[PDB]
PDB file of C-alpha atoms in Angstrom:
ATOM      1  CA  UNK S  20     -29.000 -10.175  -2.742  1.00 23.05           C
ATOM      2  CA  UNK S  21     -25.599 -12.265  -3.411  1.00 23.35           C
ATOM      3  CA  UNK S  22     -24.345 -13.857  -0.386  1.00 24.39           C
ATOM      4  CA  UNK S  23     -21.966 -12.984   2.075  1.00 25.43           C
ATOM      5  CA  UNK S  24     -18.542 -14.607   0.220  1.00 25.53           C
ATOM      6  CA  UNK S  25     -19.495 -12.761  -2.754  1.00 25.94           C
ATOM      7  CA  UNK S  26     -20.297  -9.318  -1.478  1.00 29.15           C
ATOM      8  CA  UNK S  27     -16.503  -9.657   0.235  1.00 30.01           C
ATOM      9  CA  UNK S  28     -14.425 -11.279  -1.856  1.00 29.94           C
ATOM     10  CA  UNK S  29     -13.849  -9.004  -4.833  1.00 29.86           C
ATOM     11  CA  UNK S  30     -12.353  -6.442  -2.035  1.00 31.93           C
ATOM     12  CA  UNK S  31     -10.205  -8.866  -0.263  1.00 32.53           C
ATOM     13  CA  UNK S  32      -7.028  -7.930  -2.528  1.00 31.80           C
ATOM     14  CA  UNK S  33      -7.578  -4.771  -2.268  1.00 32.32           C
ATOM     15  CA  UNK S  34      -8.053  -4.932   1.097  1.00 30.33           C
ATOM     16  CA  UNK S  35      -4.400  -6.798   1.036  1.00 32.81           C
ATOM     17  CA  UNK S  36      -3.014  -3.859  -0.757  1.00 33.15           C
ATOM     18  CA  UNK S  37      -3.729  -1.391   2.365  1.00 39.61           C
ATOM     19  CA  UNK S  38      -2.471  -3.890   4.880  1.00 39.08           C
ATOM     20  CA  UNK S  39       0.691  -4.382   3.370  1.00 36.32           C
ATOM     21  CA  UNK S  40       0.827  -1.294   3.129  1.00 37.28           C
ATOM     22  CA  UNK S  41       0.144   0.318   6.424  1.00 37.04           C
ATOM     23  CA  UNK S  42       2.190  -2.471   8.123  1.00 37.47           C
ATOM     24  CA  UNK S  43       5.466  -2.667   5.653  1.00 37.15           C
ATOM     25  CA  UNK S  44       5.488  -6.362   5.319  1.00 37.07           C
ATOM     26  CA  UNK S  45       3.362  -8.660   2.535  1.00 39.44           C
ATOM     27  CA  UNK S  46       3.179 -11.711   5.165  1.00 39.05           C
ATOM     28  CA  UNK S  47       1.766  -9.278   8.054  1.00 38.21           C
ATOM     29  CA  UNK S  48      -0.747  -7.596   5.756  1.00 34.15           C
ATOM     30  CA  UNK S  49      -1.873 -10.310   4.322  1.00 33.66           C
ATOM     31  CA  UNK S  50      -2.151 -12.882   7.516  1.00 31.66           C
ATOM     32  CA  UNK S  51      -4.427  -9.842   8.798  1.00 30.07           C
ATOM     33  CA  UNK S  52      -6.521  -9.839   6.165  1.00 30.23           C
ATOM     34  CA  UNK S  53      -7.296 -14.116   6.201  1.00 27.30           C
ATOM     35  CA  UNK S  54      -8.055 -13.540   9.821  1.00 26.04           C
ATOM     36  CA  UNK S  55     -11.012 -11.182   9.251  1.00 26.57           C
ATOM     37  CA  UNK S  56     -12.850 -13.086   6.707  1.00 27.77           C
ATOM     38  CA  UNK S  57     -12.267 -16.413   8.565  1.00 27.53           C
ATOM     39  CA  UNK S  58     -14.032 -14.447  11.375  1.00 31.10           C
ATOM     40  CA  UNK S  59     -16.717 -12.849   9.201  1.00 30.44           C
ATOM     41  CA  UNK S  60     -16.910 -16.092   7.402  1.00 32.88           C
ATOM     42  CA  UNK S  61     -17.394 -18.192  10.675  1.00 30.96           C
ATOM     43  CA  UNK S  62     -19.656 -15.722  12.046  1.00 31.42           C
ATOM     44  CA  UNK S  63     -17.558 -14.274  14.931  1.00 31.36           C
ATOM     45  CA  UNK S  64     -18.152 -11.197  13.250  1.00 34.38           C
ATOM     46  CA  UNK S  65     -21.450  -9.274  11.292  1.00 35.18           C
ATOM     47  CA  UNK S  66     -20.787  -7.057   8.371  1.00 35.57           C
ATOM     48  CA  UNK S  67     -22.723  -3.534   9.318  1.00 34.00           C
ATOM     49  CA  UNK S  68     -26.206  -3.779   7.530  1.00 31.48           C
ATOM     50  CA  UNK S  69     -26.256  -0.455   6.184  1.00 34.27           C
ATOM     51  CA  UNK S  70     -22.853   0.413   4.639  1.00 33.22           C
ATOM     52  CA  UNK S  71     -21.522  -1.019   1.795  1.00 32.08           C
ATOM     53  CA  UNK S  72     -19.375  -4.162   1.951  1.00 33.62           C
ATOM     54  CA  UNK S  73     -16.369  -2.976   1.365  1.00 35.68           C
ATOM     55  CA  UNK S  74     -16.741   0.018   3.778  1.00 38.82           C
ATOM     56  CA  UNK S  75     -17.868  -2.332   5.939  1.00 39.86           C
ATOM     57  CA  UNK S  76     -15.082  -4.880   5.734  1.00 40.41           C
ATOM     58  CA  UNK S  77     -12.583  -2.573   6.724  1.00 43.89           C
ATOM     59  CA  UNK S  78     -14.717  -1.611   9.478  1.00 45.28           C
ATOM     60  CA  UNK S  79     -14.378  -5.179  10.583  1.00 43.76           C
ATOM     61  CA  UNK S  80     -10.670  -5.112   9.912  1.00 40.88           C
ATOM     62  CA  UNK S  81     -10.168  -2.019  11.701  1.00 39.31           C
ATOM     63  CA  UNK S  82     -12.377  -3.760  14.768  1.00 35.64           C
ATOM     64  CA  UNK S  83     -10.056  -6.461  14.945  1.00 36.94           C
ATOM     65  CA  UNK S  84      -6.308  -4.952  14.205  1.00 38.88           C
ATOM     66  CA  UNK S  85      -6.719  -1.342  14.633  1.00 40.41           C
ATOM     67  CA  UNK S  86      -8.806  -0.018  17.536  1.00 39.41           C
ATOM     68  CA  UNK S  87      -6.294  -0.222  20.656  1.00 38.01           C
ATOM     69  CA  UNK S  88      -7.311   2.572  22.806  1.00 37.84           C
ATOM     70  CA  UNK S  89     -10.369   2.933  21.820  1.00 35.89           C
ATOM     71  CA  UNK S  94     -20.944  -3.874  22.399  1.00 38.31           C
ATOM     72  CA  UNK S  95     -18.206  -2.872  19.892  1.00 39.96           C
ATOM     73  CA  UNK S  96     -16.028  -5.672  18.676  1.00 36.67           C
ATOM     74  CA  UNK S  97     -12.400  -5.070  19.602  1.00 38.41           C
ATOM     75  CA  UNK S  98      -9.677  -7.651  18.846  1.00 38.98           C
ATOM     76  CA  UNK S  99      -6.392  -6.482  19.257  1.00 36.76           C
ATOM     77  CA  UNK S 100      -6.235  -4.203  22.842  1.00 38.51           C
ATOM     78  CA  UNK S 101      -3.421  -1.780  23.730  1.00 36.84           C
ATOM     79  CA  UNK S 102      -1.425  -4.382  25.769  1.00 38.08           C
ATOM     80  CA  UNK S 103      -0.680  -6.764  22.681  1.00 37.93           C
ATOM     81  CA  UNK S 104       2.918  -7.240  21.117  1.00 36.33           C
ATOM     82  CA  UNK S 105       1.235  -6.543  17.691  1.00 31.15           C
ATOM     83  CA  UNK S 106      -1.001  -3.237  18.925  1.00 29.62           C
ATOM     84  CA  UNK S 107       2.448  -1.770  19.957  1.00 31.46           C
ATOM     85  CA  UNK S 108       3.868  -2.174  16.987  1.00 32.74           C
ATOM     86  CA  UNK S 109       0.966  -0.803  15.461  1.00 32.86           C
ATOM     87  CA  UNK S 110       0.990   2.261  17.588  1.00 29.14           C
ATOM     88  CA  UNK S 111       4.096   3.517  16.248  1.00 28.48           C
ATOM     89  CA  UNK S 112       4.483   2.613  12.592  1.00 25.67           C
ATOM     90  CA  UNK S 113       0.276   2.795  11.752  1.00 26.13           C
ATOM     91  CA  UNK S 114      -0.872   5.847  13.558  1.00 27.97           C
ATOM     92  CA  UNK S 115      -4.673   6.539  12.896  1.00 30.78           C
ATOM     93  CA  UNK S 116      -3.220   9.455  11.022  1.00 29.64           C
ATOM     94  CA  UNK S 117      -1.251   7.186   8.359  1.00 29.78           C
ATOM     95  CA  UNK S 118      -4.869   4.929   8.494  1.00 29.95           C
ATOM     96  CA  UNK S 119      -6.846   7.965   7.688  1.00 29.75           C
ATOM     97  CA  UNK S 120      -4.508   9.399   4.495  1.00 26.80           C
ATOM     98  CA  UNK S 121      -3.960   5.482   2.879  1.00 32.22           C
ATOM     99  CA  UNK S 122      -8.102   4.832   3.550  1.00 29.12           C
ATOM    100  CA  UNK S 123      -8.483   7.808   0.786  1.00 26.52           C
ATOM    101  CA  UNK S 124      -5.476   8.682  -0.986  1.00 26.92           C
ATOM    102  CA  UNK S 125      -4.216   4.727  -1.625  1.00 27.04           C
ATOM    103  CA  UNK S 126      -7.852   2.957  -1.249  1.00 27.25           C
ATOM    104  CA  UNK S 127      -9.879   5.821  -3.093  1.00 27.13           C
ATOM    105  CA  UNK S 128     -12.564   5.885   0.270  1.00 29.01           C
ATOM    106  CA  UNK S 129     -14.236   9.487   0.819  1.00 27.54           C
ATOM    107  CA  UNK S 130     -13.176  11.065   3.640  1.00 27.33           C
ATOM    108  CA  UNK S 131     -17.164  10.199   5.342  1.00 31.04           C
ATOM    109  CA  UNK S 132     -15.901   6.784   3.999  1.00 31.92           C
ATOM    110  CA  UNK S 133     -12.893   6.957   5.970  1.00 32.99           C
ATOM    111  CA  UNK S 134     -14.882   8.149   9.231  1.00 33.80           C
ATOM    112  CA  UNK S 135     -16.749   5.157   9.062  1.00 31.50           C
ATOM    113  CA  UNK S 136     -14.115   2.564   8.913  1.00 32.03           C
ATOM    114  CA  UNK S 137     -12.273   5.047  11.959  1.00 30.03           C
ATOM    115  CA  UNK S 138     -15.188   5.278  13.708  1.00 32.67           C
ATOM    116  CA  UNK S 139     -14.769   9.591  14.042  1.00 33.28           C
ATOM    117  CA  UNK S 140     -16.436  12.345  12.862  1.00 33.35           C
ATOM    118  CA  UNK S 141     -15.670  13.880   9.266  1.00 33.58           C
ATOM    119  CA  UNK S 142     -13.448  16.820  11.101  1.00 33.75           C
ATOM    120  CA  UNK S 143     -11.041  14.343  12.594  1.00 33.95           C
ATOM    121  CA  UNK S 144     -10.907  12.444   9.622  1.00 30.16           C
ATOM    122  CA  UNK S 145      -9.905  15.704   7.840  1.00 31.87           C
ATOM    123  CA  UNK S 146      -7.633  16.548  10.697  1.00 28.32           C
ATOM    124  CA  UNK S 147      -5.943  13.080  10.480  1.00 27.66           C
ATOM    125  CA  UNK S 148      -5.080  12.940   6.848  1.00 23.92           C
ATOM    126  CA  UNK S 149      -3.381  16.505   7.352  1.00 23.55           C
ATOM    127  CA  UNK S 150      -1.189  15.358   9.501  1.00 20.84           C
ATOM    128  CA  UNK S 151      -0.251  12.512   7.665  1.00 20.95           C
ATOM    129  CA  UNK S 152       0.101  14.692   4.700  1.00 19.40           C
ATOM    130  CA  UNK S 153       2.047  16.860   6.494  1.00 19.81           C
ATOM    131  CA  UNK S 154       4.572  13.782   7.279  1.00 18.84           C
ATOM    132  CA  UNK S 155       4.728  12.198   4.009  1.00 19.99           C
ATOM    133  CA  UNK S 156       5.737  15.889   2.243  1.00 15.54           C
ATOM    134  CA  UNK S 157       7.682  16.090   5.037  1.00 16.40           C
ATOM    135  CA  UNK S 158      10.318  13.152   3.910  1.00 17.70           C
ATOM    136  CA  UNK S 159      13.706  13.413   2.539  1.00 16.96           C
ATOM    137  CA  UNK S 160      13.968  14.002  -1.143  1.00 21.45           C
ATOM    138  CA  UNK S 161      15.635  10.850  -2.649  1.00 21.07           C
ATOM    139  CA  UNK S 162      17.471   9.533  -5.914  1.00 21.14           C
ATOM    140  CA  UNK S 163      14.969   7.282  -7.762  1.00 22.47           C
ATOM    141  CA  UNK S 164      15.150   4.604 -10.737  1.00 23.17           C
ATOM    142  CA  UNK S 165      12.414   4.000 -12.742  1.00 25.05           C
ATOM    143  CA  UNK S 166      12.138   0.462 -14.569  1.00 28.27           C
ATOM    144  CA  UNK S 167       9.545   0.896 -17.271  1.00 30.50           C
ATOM    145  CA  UNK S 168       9.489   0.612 -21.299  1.00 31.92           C
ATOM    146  CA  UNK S 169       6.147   1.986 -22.112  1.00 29.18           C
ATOM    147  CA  UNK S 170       7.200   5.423 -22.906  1.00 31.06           C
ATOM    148  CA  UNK S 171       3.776   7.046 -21.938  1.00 32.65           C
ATOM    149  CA  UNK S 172       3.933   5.277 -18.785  1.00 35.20           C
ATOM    150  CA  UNK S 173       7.775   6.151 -17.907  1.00 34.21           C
ATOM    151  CA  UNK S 174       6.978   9.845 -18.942  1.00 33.96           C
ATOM    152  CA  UNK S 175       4.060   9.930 -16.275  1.00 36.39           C
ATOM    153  CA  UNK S 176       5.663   8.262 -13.156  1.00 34.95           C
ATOM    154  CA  UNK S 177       8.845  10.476 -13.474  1.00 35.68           C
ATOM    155  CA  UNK S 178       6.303  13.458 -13.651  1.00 34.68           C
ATOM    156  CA  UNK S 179       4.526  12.418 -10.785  1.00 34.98           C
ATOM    157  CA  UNK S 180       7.976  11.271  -8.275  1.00 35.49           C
ATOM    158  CA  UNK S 181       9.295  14.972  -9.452  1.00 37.36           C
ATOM    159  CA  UNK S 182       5.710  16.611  -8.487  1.00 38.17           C
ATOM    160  CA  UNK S 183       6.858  15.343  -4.409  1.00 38.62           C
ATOM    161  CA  UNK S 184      10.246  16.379  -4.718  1.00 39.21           C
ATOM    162  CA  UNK S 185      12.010  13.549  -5.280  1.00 41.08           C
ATOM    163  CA  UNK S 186      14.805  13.615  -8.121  1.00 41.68           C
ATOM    164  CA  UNK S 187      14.544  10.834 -10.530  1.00 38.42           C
ATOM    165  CA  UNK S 188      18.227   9.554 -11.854  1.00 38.27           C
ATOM    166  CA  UNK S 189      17.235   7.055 -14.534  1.00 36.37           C
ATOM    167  CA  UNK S 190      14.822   5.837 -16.865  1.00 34.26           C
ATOM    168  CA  UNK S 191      15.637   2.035 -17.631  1.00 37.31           C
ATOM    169  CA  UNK S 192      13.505   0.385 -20.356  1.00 35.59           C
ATOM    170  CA  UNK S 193      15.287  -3.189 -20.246  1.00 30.34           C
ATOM    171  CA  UNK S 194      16.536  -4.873 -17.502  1.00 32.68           C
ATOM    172  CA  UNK S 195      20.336  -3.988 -18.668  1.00 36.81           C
ATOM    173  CA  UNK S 196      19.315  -0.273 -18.865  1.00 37.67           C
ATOM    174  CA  UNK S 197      18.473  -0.685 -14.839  1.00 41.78           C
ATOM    175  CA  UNK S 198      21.590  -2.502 -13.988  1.00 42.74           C
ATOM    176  CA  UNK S 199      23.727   0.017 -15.807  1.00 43.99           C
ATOM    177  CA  UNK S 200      22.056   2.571 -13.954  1.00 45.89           C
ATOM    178  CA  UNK S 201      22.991   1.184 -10.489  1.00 46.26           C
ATOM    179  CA  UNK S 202      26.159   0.412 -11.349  1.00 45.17           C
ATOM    180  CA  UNK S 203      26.576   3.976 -11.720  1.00 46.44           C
ATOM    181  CA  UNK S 204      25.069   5.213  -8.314  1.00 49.11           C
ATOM    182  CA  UNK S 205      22.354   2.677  -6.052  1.00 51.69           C
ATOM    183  CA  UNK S 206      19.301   4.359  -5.909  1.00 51.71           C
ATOM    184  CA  UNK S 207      17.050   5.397  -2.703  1.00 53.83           C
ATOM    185  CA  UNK S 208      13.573   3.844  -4.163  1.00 56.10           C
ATOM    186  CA  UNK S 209      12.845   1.797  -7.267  1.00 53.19           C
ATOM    187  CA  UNK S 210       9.790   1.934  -9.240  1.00 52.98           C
ATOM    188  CA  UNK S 211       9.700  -0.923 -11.445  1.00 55.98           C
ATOM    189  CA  UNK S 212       7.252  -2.935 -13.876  1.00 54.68           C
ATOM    190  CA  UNK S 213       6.134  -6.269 -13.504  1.00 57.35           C
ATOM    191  CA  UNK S 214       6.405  -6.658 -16.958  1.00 55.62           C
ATOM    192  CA  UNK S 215       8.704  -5.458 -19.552  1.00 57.10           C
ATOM    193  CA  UNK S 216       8.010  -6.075 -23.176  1.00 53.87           C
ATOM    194  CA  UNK S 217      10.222  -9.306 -23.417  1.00 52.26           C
ATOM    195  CA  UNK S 218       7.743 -10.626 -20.657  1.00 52.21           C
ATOM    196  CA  UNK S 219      10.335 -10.104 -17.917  1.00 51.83           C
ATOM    197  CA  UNK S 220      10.334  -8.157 -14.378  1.00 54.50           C
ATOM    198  CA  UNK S 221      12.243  -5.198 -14.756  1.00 56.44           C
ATOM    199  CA  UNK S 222      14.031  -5.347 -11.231  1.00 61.05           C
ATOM    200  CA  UNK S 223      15.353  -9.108 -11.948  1.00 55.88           C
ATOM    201  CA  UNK S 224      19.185  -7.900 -12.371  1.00 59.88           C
ATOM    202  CA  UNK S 225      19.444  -5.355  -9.829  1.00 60.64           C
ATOM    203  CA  UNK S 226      16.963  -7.060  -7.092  1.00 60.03           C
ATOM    204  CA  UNK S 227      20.428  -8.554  -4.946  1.00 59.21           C
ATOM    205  CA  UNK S 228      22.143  -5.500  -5.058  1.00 57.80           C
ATOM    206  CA  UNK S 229      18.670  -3.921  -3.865  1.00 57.02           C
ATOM    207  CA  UNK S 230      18.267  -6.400  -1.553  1.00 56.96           C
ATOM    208  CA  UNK S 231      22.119  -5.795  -0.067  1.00 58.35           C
ATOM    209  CA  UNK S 232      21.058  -1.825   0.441  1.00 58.08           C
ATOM    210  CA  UNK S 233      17.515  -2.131   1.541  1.00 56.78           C
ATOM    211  CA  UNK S 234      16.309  -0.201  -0.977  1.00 57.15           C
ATOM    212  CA  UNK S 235      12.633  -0.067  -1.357  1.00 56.59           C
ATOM    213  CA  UNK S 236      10.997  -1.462  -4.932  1.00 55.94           C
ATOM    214  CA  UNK S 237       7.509  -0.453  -5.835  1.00 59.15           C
ATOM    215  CA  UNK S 238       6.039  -2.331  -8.515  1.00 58.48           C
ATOM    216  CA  UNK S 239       4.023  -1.013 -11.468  1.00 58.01           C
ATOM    217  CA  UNK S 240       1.536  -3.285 -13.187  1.00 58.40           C
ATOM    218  CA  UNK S 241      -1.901  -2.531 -14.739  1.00 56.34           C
ATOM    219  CA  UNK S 242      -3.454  -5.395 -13.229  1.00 58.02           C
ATOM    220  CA  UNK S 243      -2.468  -5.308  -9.397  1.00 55.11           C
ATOM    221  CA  UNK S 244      -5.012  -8.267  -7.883  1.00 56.64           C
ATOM    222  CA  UNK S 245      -2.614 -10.913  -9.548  1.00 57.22           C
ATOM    223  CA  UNK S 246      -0.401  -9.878  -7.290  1.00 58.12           C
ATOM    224  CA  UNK S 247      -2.817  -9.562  -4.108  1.00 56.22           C
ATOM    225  CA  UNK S 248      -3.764 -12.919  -3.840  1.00 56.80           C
ATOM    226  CA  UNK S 249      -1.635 -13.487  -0.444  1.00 60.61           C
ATOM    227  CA  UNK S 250      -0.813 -17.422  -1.592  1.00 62.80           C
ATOM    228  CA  UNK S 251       2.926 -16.763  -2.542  1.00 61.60           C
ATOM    229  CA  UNK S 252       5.632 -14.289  -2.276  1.00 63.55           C
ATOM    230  CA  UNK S 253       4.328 -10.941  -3.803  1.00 58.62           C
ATOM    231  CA  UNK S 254       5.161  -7.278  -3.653  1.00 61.47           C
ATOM    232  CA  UNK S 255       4.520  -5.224  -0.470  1.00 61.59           C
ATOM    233  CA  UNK S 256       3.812  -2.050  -2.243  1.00 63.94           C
ATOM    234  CA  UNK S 257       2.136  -1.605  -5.403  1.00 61.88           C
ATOM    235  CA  UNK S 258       0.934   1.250  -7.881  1.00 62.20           C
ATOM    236  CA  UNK S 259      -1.540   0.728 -10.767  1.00 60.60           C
ATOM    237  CA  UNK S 260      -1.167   2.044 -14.080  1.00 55.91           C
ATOM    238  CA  UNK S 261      -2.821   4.358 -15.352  1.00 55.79           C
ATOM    239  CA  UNK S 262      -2.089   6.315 -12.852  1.00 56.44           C
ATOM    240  CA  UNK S 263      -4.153   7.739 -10.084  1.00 59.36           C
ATOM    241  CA  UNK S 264      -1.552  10.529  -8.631  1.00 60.47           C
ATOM    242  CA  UNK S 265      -3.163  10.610  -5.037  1.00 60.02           C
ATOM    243  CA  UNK S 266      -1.967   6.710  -4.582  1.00 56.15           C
ATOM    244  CA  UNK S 267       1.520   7.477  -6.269  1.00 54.01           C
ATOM    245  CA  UNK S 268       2.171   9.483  -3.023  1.00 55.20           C
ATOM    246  CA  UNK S 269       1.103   7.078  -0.898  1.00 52.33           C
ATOM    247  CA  UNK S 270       2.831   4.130  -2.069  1.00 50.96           C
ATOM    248  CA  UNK S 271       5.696   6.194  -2.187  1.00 46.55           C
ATOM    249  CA  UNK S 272       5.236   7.942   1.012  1.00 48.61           C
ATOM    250  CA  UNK S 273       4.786   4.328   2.642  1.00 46.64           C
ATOM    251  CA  UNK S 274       8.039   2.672   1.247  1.00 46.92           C
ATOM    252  CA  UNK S 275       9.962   5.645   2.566  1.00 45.52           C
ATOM    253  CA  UNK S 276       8.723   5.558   5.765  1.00 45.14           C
ATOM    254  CA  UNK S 277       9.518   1.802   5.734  1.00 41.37           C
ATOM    255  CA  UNK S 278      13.106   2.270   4.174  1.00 42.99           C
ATOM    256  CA  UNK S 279      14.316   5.785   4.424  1.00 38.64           C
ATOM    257  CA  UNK S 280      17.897   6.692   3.490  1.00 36.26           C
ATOM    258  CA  UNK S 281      17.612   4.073   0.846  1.00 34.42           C
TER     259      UNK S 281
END
């Protein structure tokens, strides 16, 4: 019975999570996501009646961003700067494996937002499996102090293959590290136990190498907000393994080599 802001709005970080990302960039993701609830909220568009509302928001955003080539709402059509782009680095295939394994959706879940059946649902997130085991095994740093925590994540990068170089607990531990060889991916905490980010002295030489930085906080809305500069790819703790390899498998394909 609660009205239509409140059935949406504690999705709409969430929401900003898969955006960023499925298209590699906070500002993108998140400028996608204002647009469809100023539409829903303006009444351009209607939630579905029957599904829940946060199935049915990503319906919508999948109406407006996501259905070039497909009565049915349809924003973005093949022809559009932004649906090319789209084409090649957010294949339905990459949709279909973030909409369960980084979102948590059921694979009928999925089919809804897709609008497909539940065999080409299945059919799409094995191919996007597939692709993401597929990529390079890498060198990664890990920037966290909670020993549990560190002891998990390095579990769970070595589970896909990748071959973890360093454990850094402060932020001097991490900038020892890459003084001794730069990493291909980071996975760093927000927050140490002194309060501050773990990337903060190795973020310029990073930055100089493109070298992708997943952050690792146990409250991940803070930074989903899309009203300041924020990370583009993000991984709760505890951790839910399935959306380890998808935050991972995203920042690769983003920024392989590094």
């Amino acid at each position: 019975e609660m009205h239509l802001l409140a059935r949406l709005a504690p999705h709409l970080p969430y929401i900003r999570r898969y955006a960023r990302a499925l298209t590699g960039d906070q500002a993108t993701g998140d400028h996608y996501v204002r647009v469809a609830l100023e539409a829903l909220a303006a009444g351009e568009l209607v939630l579905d009646a029957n599904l829940s509302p946060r199935v049915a928001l990503y319906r919508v955003f999948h109406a407006i961003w996501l259905s070039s080539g497909a009565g049915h709402d349809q924003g973005l059509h093949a022809g559009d700067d932004a649906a090319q782009r789209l084409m090649r680095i957010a294949p339905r295939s990459r949709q279909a494996f973030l909409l369960t394994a980084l979102e948590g959706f059921t694979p009928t879940e999925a089919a809804q937002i897709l609008d497909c059946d539940f065999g080409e649902v299945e059919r799409l997130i094995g191919d996007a499996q597939a692709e993401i085991d597929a990529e390079l095994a890498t060198e990664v740093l890990i920037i966290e102090d909670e020993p549990v925590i560190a002891a998990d994540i390095e579990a769970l990068v070595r589970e896909l293959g990748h071959d973890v170089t360093d454990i850094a607990a402060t932020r001097g531990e991490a900038l020892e590290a890459v003084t001794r060889r730069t990493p291909g991916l980071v996975l760093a905490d927000i927050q140490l136990a002194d309060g501050s980010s773990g990337i903060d002295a190795v973020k310029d030489i990073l930055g100089r190498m493109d070298v992708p930085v997943i952050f690792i906080t146990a409250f991940p809305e803070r930074l989903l907000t899309g009203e300041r500069p924020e990370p583009t790819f993000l991984i709760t703790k505890p951790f839910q393994p399935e959306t380890v390899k998808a935050a991972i498998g995203q920042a690769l394909f983003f920024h392989p080599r590094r």
